[PDB]
Amino acid sequence: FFHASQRDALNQSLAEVQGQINVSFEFFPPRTSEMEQTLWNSIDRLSSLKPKFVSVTYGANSGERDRTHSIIKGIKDRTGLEAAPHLTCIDATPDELRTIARDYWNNGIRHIVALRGDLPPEMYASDLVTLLKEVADFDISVAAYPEVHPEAKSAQADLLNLKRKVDAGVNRAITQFFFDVESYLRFRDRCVSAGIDVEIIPGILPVSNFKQAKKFADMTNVRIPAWMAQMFDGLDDDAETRKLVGANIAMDMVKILSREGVKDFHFYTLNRAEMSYAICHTLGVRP
Amino acid sequence: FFHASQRDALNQSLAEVQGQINVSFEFFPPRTSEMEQTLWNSIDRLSSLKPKFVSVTYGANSGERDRTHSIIKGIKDRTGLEAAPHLTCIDATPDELRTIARDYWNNGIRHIVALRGDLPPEMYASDLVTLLKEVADFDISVAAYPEVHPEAKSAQADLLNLKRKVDAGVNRAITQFFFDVESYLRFRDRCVSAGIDVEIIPGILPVSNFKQAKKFADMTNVRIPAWMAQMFDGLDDDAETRKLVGANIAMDMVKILSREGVKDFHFYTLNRAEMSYAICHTLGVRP
Amino acid sequence: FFHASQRDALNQSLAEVQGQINVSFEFFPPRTSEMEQTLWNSIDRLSSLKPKFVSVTYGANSGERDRTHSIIKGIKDRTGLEAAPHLTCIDATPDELRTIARDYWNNGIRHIVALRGDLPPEMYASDLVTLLKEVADFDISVAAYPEVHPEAKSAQADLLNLKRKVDAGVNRAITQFFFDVESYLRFRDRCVSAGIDVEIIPGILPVSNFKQAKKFADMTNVRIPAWMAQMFDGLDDDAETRKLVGANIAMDMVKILSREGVKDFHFYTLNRAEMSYAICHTLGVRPG
Amino acid sequence: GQINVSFEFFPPRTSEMEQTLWNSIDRLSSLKPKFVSVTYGANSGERDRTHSIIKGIKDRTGLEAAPHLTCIDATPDELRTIARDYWNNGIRHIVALRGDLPPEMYASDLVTLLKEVADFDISVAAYPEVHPEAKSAQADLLNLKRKVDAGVNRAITQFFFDVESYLRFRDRCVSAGIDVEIIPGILPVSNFKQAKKFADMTNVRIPAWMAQMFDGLDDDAETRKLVGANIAMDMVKILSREGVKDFHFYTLNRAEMSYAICHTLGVRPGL
Ligand SMILES: Cc1cc2nc3c(=O)[nH]c(=O)nc-3n(C[C@H](O)[C@H](O)[C@H](O)COP(=O)(O)OP(=O)(O)OC[C@H]3O[C@@H](n4cnc5c(N)ncnc54)[C@H](O)[C@@H]3O)c2cc1C
Ligand SMILES: Cc1cc2nc3c(=O)[nH]c(=O)nc-3n(C[C@H](O)[C@H](O)[C@H](O)COP(=O)(O)OP(=O)(O)OC[C@H]3O[C@@H](n4cnc5c(N)ncnc54)[C@H](O)[C@@H]3O)c2cc1C
Numbered sequence A, B: 001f002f003h004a005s006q007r008d009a010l011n012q013s014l015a016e017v018q019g020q021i022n023v024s025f026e027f028f029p030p031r032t033s034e035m036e037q038t039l040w041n042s043i044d045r046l047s048s049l050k051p052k053f054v055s056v057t058y059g060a061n062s063g064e065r066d067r068t069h070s071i072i073k074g075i076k077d078r079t080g081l082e083a084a085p086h087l088t089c090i091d092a093t094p095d096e097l098r099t100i101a102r103d104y105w106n107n108g109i110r111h112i113v114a115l116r117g118d119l120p121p122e123m124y125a126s127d128l129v130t131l132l133k134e135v136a137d138f139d140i141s142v143a144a145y146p147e148v149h150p151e152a153k154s155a156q157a158d159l160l161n162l163k164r165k166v167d168a169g170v171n172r173a174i175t176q177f178f179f180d181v182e183s184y185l186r187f188r189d190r191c192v193s194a195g196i197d198v199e200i201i202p203g204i205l206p207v208s209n210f211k212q213a214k215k216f217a218d219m220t221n222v223r224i225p226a227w228m229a230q231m232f233d234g235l236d237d238d239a240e241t242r243k244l245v246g247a248n249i250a251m252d253m254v255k256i257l258s259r260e261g262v263k264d265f266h267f268y269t270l271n272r273a274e275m276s277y278a279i280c281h282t283l284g285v286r287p
Numbered sequence C: 001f002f003h004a005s006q007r008d009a010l011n012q013s014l015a016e017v018q019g020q021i022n023v024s025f026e027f028f029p030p031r032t033s034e035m036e037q038t039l040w041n042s043i044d045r046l047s048s049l050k051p052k053f054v055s056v057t058y059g060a061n062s063g064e065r066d067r068t069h070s071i072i073k074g075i076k077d078r079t080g081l082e083a084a085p086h087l088t089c090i091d092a093t094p095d096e097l098r099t100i101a102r103d104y105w106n107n108g109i110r111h112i113v114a115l116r117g118d119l120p121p122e123m124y125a126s127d128l129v130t131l132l133k134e135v136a137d138f139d140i141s142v143a144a145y146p147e148v149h150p151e152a153k154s155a156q157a158d159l160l161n162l163k164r165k166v167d168a169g170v171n172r173a174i175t176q177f178f179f180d181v182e183s184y185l186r187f188r189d190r191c192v193s194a195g196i197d198v199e200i201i202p203g204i205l206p207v208s209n210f211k212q213a214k215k216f217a218d219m220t221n222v223r224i225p226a227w228m229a230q231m232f233d234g235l236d237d238d239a240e241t242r243k244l245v246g247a248n249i250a251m252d253m254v255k256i257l258s259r260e261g262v263k264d265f266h267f268y269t270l271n272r273a274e275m276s277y278a279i280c281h282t283l284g285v286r287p288g
Numbered sequence D: 001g002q003i004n005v006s007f008e009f010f011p012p013r014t015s016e017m018e019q020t021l022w023n024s025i026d027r028l029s030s031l032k033p034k035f036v037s038v039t040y041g042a043n044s045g046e047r048d049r050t051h052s053i054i055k056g057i058k059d060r061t062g063l064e065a066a067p068h069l070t071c072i073d074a075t076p077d078e079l080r081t082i083a084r085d086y087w088n089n090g091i092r093h094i095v096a097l098r099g100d101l102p103p104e105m106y107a108s109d110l111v112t113l114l115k116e117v118a119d120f121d122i123s124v125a126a127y128p129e130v131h132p133e134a135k136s137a138q139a140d141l142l143n144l145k146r147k148v149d150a151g152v153n154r155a156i157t158q159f160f161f162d163v164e165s166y167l168r169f170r171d172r173c174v175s176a177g178i179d180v181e182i183i184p185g186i187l188p189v190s191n192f193k194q195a196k197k198f199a200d201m202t203n204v205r206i207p208a209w210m211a212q213m214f215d216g217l218d219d220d221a222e223t224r225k226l227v228g229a230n231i232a233m234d235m236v237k238i239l240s241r242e243g244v245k246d247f248h249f250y251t252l253n254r255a256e257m258s259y260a261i262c263h264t265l266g267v268r269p270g271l
């Protein structure tokens, strides 16, 4: 019984990797008192899993950018975990960036996720990496796109950009979320073929709100397989079933990736802990 | 990428079986006002899925047995669904049984799950089937044990008993719950080899409370694979993670069984709807 | 990676079977002082595995039969395990049989392996079963032949004869040794399909001496699959390799059988403990 | 048979181990291995002991004998003299390694140096579960490719007990454009305690069923040998079914287990 054994094998393999998996969690600046509370609950919950690091997204408005720094600081004080702020090239001059970078370093924040940034309705990520490396010897993470950045002139160019980016001084790449596991695996192979020597860490998005995930997916060129669309069909008013189905999907994904050698996962928590916590548990990442 | 494709294939196959799967739900007599409320909520929730039938377990004490009948009646009135009461050979003479059977039939209850019954601290199931068939032409379901009934002198004898049982006039067999999918598949094959012509419907137990499931499993000779025990290890005080992990397991199980030709599932709901409802959804069984 | 995945699953399921396996060991009356030393050393070793029971073959020689009863007694006293003597219908009147039969029961021997017996150069096993149950409610084990008994006129006829025998009052059947798992599996299915209510316990022969195994098989109608013949080809003078190869085959066999639901094994130890001890170990059957 | 095998031996440090080794060499030589190799240990024998065994094997059996040459605590000039001497004296196959550090040169630098000296047949190490010092799995694979492109005939993998780990690695190698054979290094296990210590030290994973299989056998050598032979024969059977046509055995200087495994593979003496 093929599938029967294959499943038992996969399950047993997953149980045995307990203690070898590195995880990281991504959070975003809360916009309300309610969101803030959820965030700190999630931070405390996930901090007990001892992630290699946690990161905080960087938006464009000034208040939000001041928010990123305060939350990073708040996370460091409260948990003692390495917190990496996301830094973009949007609405910032090289001089402001060097200042922000110098201040981050002097404040004990030596890991930065260097990004170009979403374009609001000049320099590229590689330029930021170079700039940052000139300021200090930062630990740097950058974005990778298994399904190709929607702006790239070609997959070749996008893959080449990643290489250029990595060459400037990157420690790891974190992929855009995906639901087609094979796209990630193939991309990981193409990266080797492109001479990129850093680990390609999959960014995992546990889906609880499909409507919103689909919209984000449609804007980022992320493919939603037909089976997944059918799996969430008819659940617009059933949050409970969506959570169980989404967890099942996320869990199946990390199980397969783990069997393919992946030992690092980055979770897009959307500031909630439940799903990512449970996924990490199946991965053997526990308190 | 083996596992990658195999998974996508399994997932797509599951999506395409939508509308071909028959399901049934098992409930037990509530013992408190709170349990009763949960039950009716679950009944209403699951009734919208149009199960082929629902059943209600039969205990030994007199009040509980009067409970089984009232709940069956309550279910018929409220939903109009076919409700099958479980009937055991415990604390009952052939004459009482014939009376109970005659009264069930005259009351519109023509489907009975015929059982010997758990032994409290004479005749066997096959005897009850024969007795029932003499009273009326009942639609009859009986229990099957993929991992062998703990009382059987041997697997051969237990399998032979099932055949004897089926020969007396059974429409289907429902298996004891299991977590080793291969045991069920092999058993299904052995049943054919034994000349048993009824469908062997898997009884699915969605696990949310592992401690209790393990105890029941240990008493019924049901094996808990090591990977599953590890999956629930450390979750005694985390109901949320247990539910997500349990749903993942149940969902993986019905997905594999479905690919192996199973088109009938019987759920041990434990009077709760959430898990079974979500599992049925992944099976394409929706409102 | 289908072969690999299935292999992992198999090893794992076997790994957690540890504890739910029932094993029994078969011995034969030694014919030399050396053989005796070896036997009791093996009995001591294997006993620490807590076998459900152990049995001793029954020859036709009057003096050797005394050894059968004797050894059973030794085992009984020495280790305290259930020792079931083999009983044949060779050179014995229905009256003598009842004698030793109830003579055994008075000595604490409640389990007997009832056989017709090899015919040295009127009644059958079924007749002996009936004869024993009347003398007392003996726990009885009988022989089964997955590849058909040599004398049987037909597979079906042989199969019905087994039922006849079982329907006479037996608790379990033990198969002639075999090397093709399928034949055993199919036979086991045909058995339930024929209404035989007892388990068909596989008799495992761990092969170290292929030449002698092939000869015993050629006499017992047991098939030596080609792959097995090729596996031992060229090892006539290499006992070490024959042992490793044969241990491998037996471990592979009980692993497949275990995954198929078989929870009972009977080992033809040939009075040696090493191989059977190792196979049991892989089945999770280990000492304290 | 279409199946090729090679055996690995280590320099004996005692009279007893030396006798064991030569007995094994005679036994295994009859299987006509494609080649045999002899490891190196800076503080466990040095180059002279490795060279000695290689010379002995060659004169005694006439088989192709490949020394494991490391480039640690060795200068480029010394390495050149060494290679020259080996070549002029009939040693045309070398297992080029960086060496266990008791960065300088990496194995790829050694491969280049060797090819400059002569057209050696070269074998290098590959790690299905990633070399413990690698920056990442990606980098370790890239470095294998770089090493292979330097002029390698084949790669021999570190031992492993998770067969899928090897299969997945072989596929990644092919996807990476590495065209040489990735020969699985097989370790027949009789002494589990020692194997476990070496594995934990090299990041080789021990499946749960395996550790369970050796549990309670610390003082039972006979059962360990039977159980370990079973594990190895199973492994090579699966690998063989998966298209593997070459096996490299870590004999630990003992022939019984490897000889039997080869037998089950159809690799037998041509008597
Ligand atoms: C893990 C992760 C975290 C993120 N966090 C944030 C966040 O906090 N805030 C936010 O605003 N966004 C965030 N993003 C989104 C991201 O900034 C957008 O995807 C953005 O459009 C590209 O950023 P990048 O760093 O990948 O850009 P780059 O690597 O610079 O690439 C962007 C495009 O330019 C192309 N390109 C590169 N160099 C050249 C060149 N010289 N000429 C022409 N084309 C070129 C590339 O192929 C690509 O199409 C995140 C994405 C990921 C995957
Ligand atoms: C779907 C399902 C629903 C259940 N619902 C209930 C419930 O509501 N209430 C409750 O009390 N229990 C219930 N049970 C549990 C069940 O009653 C126990 O497992 C009980 O021990 C056996 O019942 P059975 O109908 O399988 O018995 P049977 O089929 O009669 O078998 C019981 C044992 O007797 C053996 N046997 C049969 N005939 C003979 C013979 N002539 N001589 C010797 N041995 C023989 C069989 O091999 C077996 O070991 C349920 C089980 C399942 C799987």
Ligand SMILES: Cc1cc2nc3c(=O)[nH]c(=O)nc-3n(C[C@H](O)[C@H](O)[C@H](O)COP(=O)(O)OP(=O)(O)OC[C@H]3O[C@@H](n4cnc5c(N)ncnc54)[C@H](O)[C@@H]3O)c2cc1C
Binding pocket: C056, C057, C058, C059, C086, C087, C088, C113, C114, C115, C116, C117, C118, C119, C124, C125, C126, C142, C143, C144, C149, C150, C151, C152, C153, C157, C158, C159, C161, C164, C165, C174, C175, C176, C177, C203
């Ligand atoms: C576990 C095991 C232990 C054994 N131990 C011994 C031992 O210690 N000593 C020894 O001498 N031999 C022993 N044997 C061998 C055995 O006695 C021979 O195989 C013998 O030829 C048949 O014995 P049985 O009990 O199977 O005979 P039976 O079951 O009587 O069958 C023998 C033949 O008669 C046929 N048959 C059976 N009953 C009838 C009937 N009533 N009418 C017509 N045909 C019938 C069958 O089809 C068959 O061909 C053993 C075999 C096994 C597998």
Ligand SMILES: Cc1cc2nc3c(=O)[nH]c(=O)nc-3n(C[C@H](O)[C@H](O)[C@H](O)COP(=O)(O)OP(=O)(O)OC[C@H]3O[C@@H](n4cnc5c(N)ncnc54)[C@H](O)[C@@H]3O)c2cc1C
Binding pocket: D038, D039, D040, D041, D042, D068, D069, D070, D095, D096, D097, D098, D099, D100, D101, D105, D106, D107, D108, D124, D125, D126, D131, D132, D133, D134, D135, D139, D140, D141, D143, D147, D156, D157, D158, D159, D185
């Ligand atoms: C078949 C086999 C036989 C062996 N025999 C011996 C023996 O006899 N004696 C002994 O001492 N050891 C031996 N080893 C062990 C080996 O020497 C160690 O694993 C050692 O640490 C690495 O050697 P390598 O030849 O694989 O080195 P390399 O291929 O140089 O790899 C070592 C590390 O450096 C990295 N790397 C490669 N190039 C670069 C670069 N340019 N920049 C940065 N990183 C780079 C790799 O990814 C890896 O982490 C053997 C291993 C195998 C599998």
Ligand SMILES: Nc1nc2c(c(=O)[nH]1)C[C@@H](CCc1ccc(C(=O)N[C@@H](CCC(=O)O)C(=O)O)s1)CN2
Binding pocket: A028, A057, A118, A176, A177, A203, A205, A212, A213, A216, A220, A268, A270
């Ligand atoms: N183009 C782009 N890609 C990115 C990110 C980004 O900022 N831009 C960050 C990470 C975003 C991960 C997400 C996936 C789905 C998301 C989602 O559904 N967000 C909510 C909003 C959540 C909130 O309130 O912040 C929504 O779109 O309605 S957020 C990774 N990838």
Ligand SMILES: Nc1nc2c(c(=O)[nH]1)C[C@@H](CCc1ccc(C(=O)N[C@@H](CCC(=O)O)C(=O)O)s1)CN2
Binding pocket: B028, B057, B118, B176, B177, B203, B205, B212, B213, B216, B220, B268, B270
């Ligand atoms: N031997 C036996 N087997 C049976 C059943 C049975 O009644 N007896 C009915 C069905 C029982 C299915 C269950 C699996 C796990 C269960 C469980 O955990 N029950 C709770 C009690 C639930 C309640 O309050 O009724 C407990 O054991 O604590 S109930 C199927 N199999």
Ligand SMILES: Nc1nc2c(c(=O)[nH]1)C[C@@H](CCc1ccc(C(=O)N[C@@H](CCC(=O)O)C(=O)O)s1)CN2
Binding pocket: C057, C118, C176, C177, C205, C212, C213, C216, C220, C268, C270
């Ligand atoms: N026909 C028949 N079948 C039987 C048995 C029997 O007595 N007769 C008993 C059991 C015999 C099991 C054996 C398989 C191979 C054996 C063997 O090789 N015996 C050695 C003698 C014993 C020894 O090896 O010391 C030989 O024939 O040379 S003994 C089961 N089957």
Ligand SMILES: Nc1nc2c(c(=O)[nH]1)C[C@@H](CCc1ccc(C(=O)N[C@@H](CCC(=O)O)C(=O)O)s1)CN2
Binding pocket: D039, D100, D158, D159, D187, D194, D195, D198, D202, D250, D252, D253
């Ligand atoms: N890092 C590293 N990897 C290597 C080798 C090496 O030298 N270093 C050579 C080969 C070593 C193969 C071995 C696997 C297990 C071994 C072992 O247990 N050796 C015992 C000695 C066994 C004996 O010879 O009795 C020990 O030194 O503890 S030796 C292949 N891989």
